[PDB]
Amino acid sequence: QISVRGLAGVENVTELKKNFNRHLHFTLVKDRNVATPRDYYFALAHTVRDHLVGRWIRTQQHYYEKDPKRIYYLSLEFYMGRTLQNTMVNLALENACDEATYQLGLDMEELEEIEEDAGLGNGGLGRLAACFLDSMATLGLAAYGYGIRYEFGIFNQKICGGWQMEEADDWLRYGNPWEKARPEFTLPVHFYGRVEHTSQGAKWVDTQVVLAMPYDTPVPGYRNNVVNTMRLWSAKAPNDFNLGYIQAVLDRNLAENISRVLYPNDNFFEGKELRLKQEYFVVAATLQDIIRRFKSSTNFDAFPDKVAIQLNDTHPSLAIPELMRVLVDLERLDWDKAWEVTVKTCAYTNHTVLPEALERWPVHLLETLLPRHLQIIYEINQRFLNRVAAAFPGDVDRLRRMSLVEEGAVKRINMAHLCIAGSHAVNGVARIHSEILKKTIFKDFYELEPHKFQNKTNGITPRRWLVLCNPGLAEIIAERIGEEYISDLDQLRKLLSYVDDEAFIRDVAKVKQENKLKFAAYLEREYKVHINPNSLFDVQVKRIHEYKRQLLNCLHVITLYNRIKKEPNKFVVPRTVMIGGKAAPGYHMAKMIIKLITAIGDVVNHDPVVGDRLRVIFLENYRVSLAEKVIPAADLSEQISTAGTEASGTGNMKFMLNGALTIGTMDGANVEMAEEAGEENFFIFGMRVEDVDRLDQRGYNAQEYYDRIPELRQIIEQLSSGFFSPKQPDLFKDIVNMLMHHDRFKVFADYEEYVKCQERVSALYKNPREWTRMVIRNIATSGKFSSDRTIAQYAREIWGVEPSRQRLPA
Amino acid sequence: QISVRGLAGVENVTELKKNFNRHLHFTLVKDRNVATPRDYYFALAHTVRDHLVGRWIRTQQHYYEKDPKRIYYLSLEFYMGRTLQNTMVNLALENACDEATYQLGLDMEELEEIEEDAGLGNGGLGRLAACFLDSMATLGLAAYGYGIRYEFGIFNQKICGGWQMEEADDWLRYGNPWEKARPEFTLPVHFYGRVEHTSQGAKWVDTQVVLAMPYDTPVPGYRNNVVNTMRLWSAKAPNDFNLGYIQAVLDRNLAENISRVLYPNDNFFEGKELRLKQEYFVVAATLQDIIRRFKSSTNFDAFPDKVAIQLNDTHPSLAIPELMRVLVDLERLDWDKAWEVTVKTCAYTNHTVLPEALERWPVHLLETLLPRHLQIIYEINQRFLNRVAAAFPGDVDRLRRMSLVEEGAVKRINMAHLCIAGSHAVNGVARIHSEILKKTIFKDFYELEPHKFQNKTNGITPRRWLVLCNPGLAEIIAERIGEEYISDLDQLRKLLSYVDDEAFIRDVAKVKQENKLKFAAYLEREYKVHINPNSLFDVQVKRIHEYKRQLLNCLHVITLYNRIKKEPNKFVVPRTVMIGGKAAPGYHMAKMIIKLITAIGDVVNHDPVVGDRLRVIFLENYRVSLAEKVIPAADLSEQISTAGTEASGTGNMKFMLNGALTIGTMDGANVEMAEEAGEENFFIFGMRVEDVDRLDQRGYNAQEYYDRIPELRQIIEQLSSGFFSPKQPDLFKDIVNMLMHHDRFKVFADYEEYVKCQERVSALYKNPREWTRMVIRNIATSGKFSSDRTIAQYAREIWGVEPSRQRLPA
Ligand SMILES: OC[C@H]1O[C@@H](c2ncc(-c3ccccc3)[nH]2)[C@H](O)[C@@H](O)[C@@H]1O
Ligand SMILES: OC[C@H]1O[C@@H](c2ncc(-c3ccccc3)[nH]2)[C@H](O)[C@@H](O)[C@@H]1O
Ligand SMILES: *Cc1c(COP(=O)(O)O)cnc(C)c1O
Ligand SMILES: *Cc1c(COP(=O)(O)O)cnc(C)c1O
């Protein structure tokens, strides 16, 4: 059908059809008389998977022979989404599979919808890791993603009576065809125990053992025949575990719980023992695998030449003391030499400055769980602080500020400080964020070792986030500039030559309109909700958080509603306002925000005076597969975090690539997006970081805004009085109280500028041609935000390896 | 190589080789440079499995079209053992696979040893169910085995310092290629709750739900292209289960524990809640499946014409009240009609008369777990006792004896009484056992309904238990009488014509000698133990129990040792005495017996005066795969249970078929074995059932035997004084005390006759030709003990269906 989807050759189509039938019979043990759509999905998945195998084996053989430097990306989260379409895209099989299934009487798009997301992450951080794996394969790096195979990923969200309910994501129920269990490479991981000091070193003894069993998933690069590995560990009890008899067998669940469930907090630290066990489990199993592979190449001098470990935030920070443990206690290196190797091997990426998100573990937990690691951390701390003391003599407050050990009621270890001390490079994830790190929370460290600090602005893969989810847009682009841009996104700059081209303008607008119709149909079909596809699609999709300010959007929506009710017969640009995202189950305020959004919808969507000029929809169960549907359909991307709080954002980049305009604060990567596109082509509003600092210095008083802005006072009085909750008039009192007296994120301070900026959005939407021209200017300058760019920078500036676009032989 | 193993055609061998290579690459994702023997085993298993698929689909299609009466065999245990060789045997692929693997440079026997037993049973009862499934497929019956897929089967036994240790049997660790998960046919099962009485019937409400997910395993018939199904249920929590958040997800293990582990008791009742949950889980899921299949053929009159349910002991007895529940509460049949259907559908097999093995559940457990079922059982009981009262008016003691409800400290439900009331047929498992049932524990029921009571003497499948484990013997038989006997074992009678044939005599003895050499090599290789292959191999393998009297064997062994020490320079026939079997983990006396056997070995095996004239070996981890090795190697089969205690025995039959002579009491099927072969060709000793009754009437006094038999007194004094435990002289005091004062199984009473009979064994072994002739007379008369005979009797006399030997098309 469309060019970028590859060839449908007769030989290939014939072969796919016979292999589909073979799997249906032999693999699934079904015949066509009783097979369901799910069986058909599985038959196609196995058929496509077979095409990965030769390339997977050959890639891994190639790395064994050539022995390149290996990159190990450690993360507690990999938010992969679905695999079938991505695999077809990267192997150039999409049109052939479409044809084959068509000839068998099946609709491939319908089969694609059966696949479960692999939801092994919370949001941005987990999805970044997934985009990174795609880029590393596409750039030919010998890279491995290491994580935990959670039995239950991020919960499925149901909305009941306007409230979030959680249900378990039993994603493995029907089986996962994309992983390969590797029980033969199972490794032991130790917990608890005690340390004995002998004549020749410390010994960690009397430990409890849990086994780590690996499952490998292939990660195909884009049309280069490279297939890298994501290895995820699963917890298993040893067979003599607890070994009256029946109870001992049932108690194996105590060990196996380590990999049972993903902690569902986004940008928040919950200091529970089970989470710490997860963090050590992934690190301990991974490092044995790394060392095994290194020895199969005595001399650890070369370790940093052959190994890079990248820590995705502090979650795998125990890699640092674990590597020291292994080198010192087991390989018998002297401390100084072990430390040199460790520092040169490890690098740390910071993804947040919010204090409630920073990991600070109680010493007593580490003392009990990981006694040798605590000893090592103390020794690291003493030696580090000796360096600080020599560099800044007499500066005793610096010593307390920089210590890895925080004093107080409960002593804690600051894991971010540990990562900086033990890494040769520390980066933030957007230019403003990296600058904030050097100016504020890591200022002391930057003064001591300025060379360590870098920036690596985040990106997204244009395979998943354009070609896969928006084939219509990919095609009209390819018609003009060819296909090379899919792995070299900077080529989209060539589209600036088409900003006055009437045909291109028409095609860009038609693709958006088709995406909007398709999404509006999806809504009716799966959720019996009826929306106007000619309205402006105004979307904020992301995790629910105070700092992301879904509440500010809410205030705007109520303002629009009140303005309509005040002058019903005046024309306003029609909007469909869509807000979606999950709240952490324990985060009461975030759950209240969801209820507020649905409550606003209940009033607005049923007011006959409003008609279809304003609709407010809560998009349930936002996840990667839903992002792939809604983002291509959006007109306006809401990126409205308080300046200084969103380290980067990546949803922002997805919307830019897909032909939405952005309304946003100068926060995270929004700053670089505006710089690339031009400030004239971006709807920027609100306080900058320096304005937030000025407000904090004199003191934020929300009452001042309430007193001076009548439209804002009206809304607060409506909330307080029960206008949006007639049967429970005091329902939103927690929200009002927070806004009025302890709002850390200054919602009222950006309200006026936000509403005024939204008026400018509506004015531009009234002129379709000029709206579309501004869109073309955004799409054309989105190239910087490819994760191929990001990964090439990590490769050259941190890992010391050169990317390659050269094909392996097929 | 050998005839009965089928053809090795060039086309077939070529095809097997290419499919082996295909699976190795695509299924296992390995190349030949890194593949291990385990990968090679899996490649062969997938290759052989592919040959089952077409026949499996076609068989099940055939039953859908023809709609025969379906037989459902319900059991808590299916002791399947390994599947690879059995599958090759039944599909006539053994020689082709041997050739294919040979050409690939692999030894197929070595690959076969990698497969784990499916150990989903304790011993005889579980293995009977497995032999039955093989026979039902071989006889063309539309039969389904339904059970529980335990995550952990019977424990692996380790011997440490002479003591049994248990370790978990993690049989699924590397995956099970023989099962097919069928998550799409998952069914709900209810627990707890309460009963509400409405205008139109009872309602069971407020229940907790656990899901039952089926896994299907193919059961191939012998060369008839029939492939039946064994469906095993696995417990899954619903996704809203318990739905702070993390704990709710972790607590899913509470529901999933139902299928976690097999209770490891043989012929013993442990009345625990988890066991009751297992019993209901299998019954409830199975009956929904049965009813679904029946409706896909409103009129339940025809149900008994289309369905037979066979209860393997009382473990699935809840089928009776569950079927009533469904028919009355859900389908709204009147009680009398529902009862008629239930009785005509269900049949019960009893496998034990030991009081400690009979299931009697406390009413309070059923009250809490299964409140509606208790109500139904009470109603069954009232209506049944009304029938008793009308038949035997005024006999009030009969009413109390026959009641389903046992009065006492705790009221209990007698499940055997429930099964008899609700079944149209009740059978024992050997003629003497069936007679005991009518004379003793079920006498009252027999008087009320004599027509219900039958006998079905047990059997064993000659596919696994001759062709597979003893190909050498199968071959020399086939050379004389052809291959037809493998599915018509009565043809072995033709071998009586060869009892004076010098060539046949030589071949039978050579096959035994080769089996003994092979087993002696296995011992050294895997357990560094050195045995004399010219000695008489004297073997007792079976679960450790007081009633099976491993202790009586022990007394004989010590007697032989003491006789040697008394006259060292006299000739005695050399013996290797092998005893193996698992003890239930909670069964203290059985664990002490294991320790006694190893302690005797420690003394005997290291006494230089004994030399290699007597060796005592404890065979560790006895299980189906070990039985397949040791049974072909045995000379003498020890079947020495106290008369009246072993309902049938099936090991006895395995030894007979494989060329061992039997020393045994007249118990269980030993009686029929002696009758078939001739008493002259069997070493029979000891009390008959009527002698045991006479002793019980006057009172068993063990001291009398101690006082009159000096050889016996010597042994007891050795045990008591610490001769077999120097460092712990009082180690065996529990054993001595039991023997002397509370031996329910009268070990001393059979001692003299046993020792004298063993002397006759030794005398015959000195004459190889006459020993071998007696062997031929046993093998030749073993035909009755095929489970094909057994199943044809169930089919004709209980289920009302005709067996068929006709091939389905391939
Ligand atoms: O760099 C990728 C993204 O990482 C998010 C992130 N930081 C910390 C976490 C986090 C902490 C604890 C548990 C789970 C996730 N998540 C930031 O909020 C985004 O701005 C950023 O675009
Ligand atoms: O009929 C097959 C075999 O069944 C055994 C048996 N009866 C009850 C059980 C039993 C009870 C509770 C839990 C597990 C197993 N096992 C008998 O002891 C054998 O004689 C007989 O040959
Ligand atoms: C991209 C993405 C995110 C991150 O969005 P932000 O707006 O940067 O927070 C979160 N969730 C899902 C499912 C995503 O695809
Ligand atoms: C046949 C068999 C049994 C039953 O043996 P009996 O001597 O009848 O108790 C027990 N266990 C295994 C592994 C068997 O193969």
UniProtKB/Swiss-Prot annotation, chains A, B:
CDD domains in UniProt: GT35_Glycogen_Phosphorylase (cd04300)
Q: Give the E.C. number(s).
A: 2.4.1.1
Task: Indicate the annotated site residue(s) for Involved in the association of subunits.
Answer: 97, 131
An example Gene Ontology molecular-function term: pyridoxal phosphate binding
Where is the PTM Phosphoserine found along the chain?
3, 403, 487, 720-721
Q: In this chain's numbering, which residues are marked as the site (Can be labeled by an AMP analog)?
A: 144
According to the UniProt record, list the residues that bear Phosphotyrosine.
192, 215, 446
Q: Pfam families per the record?
A: Phosphorylase
> Which residues are recorded as modified (N6-(pyridoxal phosphate)lysine)?
654
Name its GO BP terms in alphabetical order.
Answer: glycogen catabolic process
Instruction: Give GO cellular component annotations, separated by semicolons.
Output: skeletal muscle myofibril
Q: Does the keyword Acetylation apply?
A: yes
**Record key words, sorted:** Acetylation, Allosteric enzyme, Carbohydrate metabolism, Glycogen metabolism, Glycosyltransferase, Nucleotide-binding, Phosphoprotein, Pyridoxal phosphate, Transferase
Cofactor(s) this protein requires: pyridoxal 5'-phosphate
What switches its activity on or off, per the activity regulation note? Allosterically regulated through the non-covalent binding of metabolites, being activated by AMP and inhibited by ATP, ADP, and glucose-6-phosphate. The activity is also controlled by post-translational modifications including phosphorylation.
**Keyword Phosphoprotein among UniProt keywords:** yes
Q: Which Gene3D superfamilies match?
A: Glycogen Phosphorylase B
Q: Which reaction does it catalyse?
A: [(1->4)-alpha-D-glucosyl](n) + phosphate = [(1->4)-alpha-D-glucosyl](n-1) + alpha-D-glucose 1-phosphate
- According to its UniProt record, how is this protein modified after translation? Phosphorylation of Ser-3 converts phosphorylase B (unphosphorylated) to phosphorylase A.
Q: Which residues are listed for AMP binding in this entry?
A: 31, 64, 292-297
> Per its UniProt record, what PANTHER family does this chain match?
GLYCOGEN PHOSPHORYLASE, GLYCOGEN PHOSPHORYLASE, MUSCLE FORM
The subunit structure is: Homodimer. Homotetramer; to form the enzymatically active phosphorylase A.
What is the documented function of this protein? Allosteric enzyme that catalyzes the rate-limiting step in glycogen catabolism, the phosphorolytic cleavage of glycogen to produce glucose-1-phosphate, and plays a central role in maintaining cellular and organismal glucose homeostasis.
The UniProt entry's sequence similarity note says:
Belongs to the glycogen phosphorylase family.
Q: What is this protein called?
A: Glycogen phosphorylase, muscle form
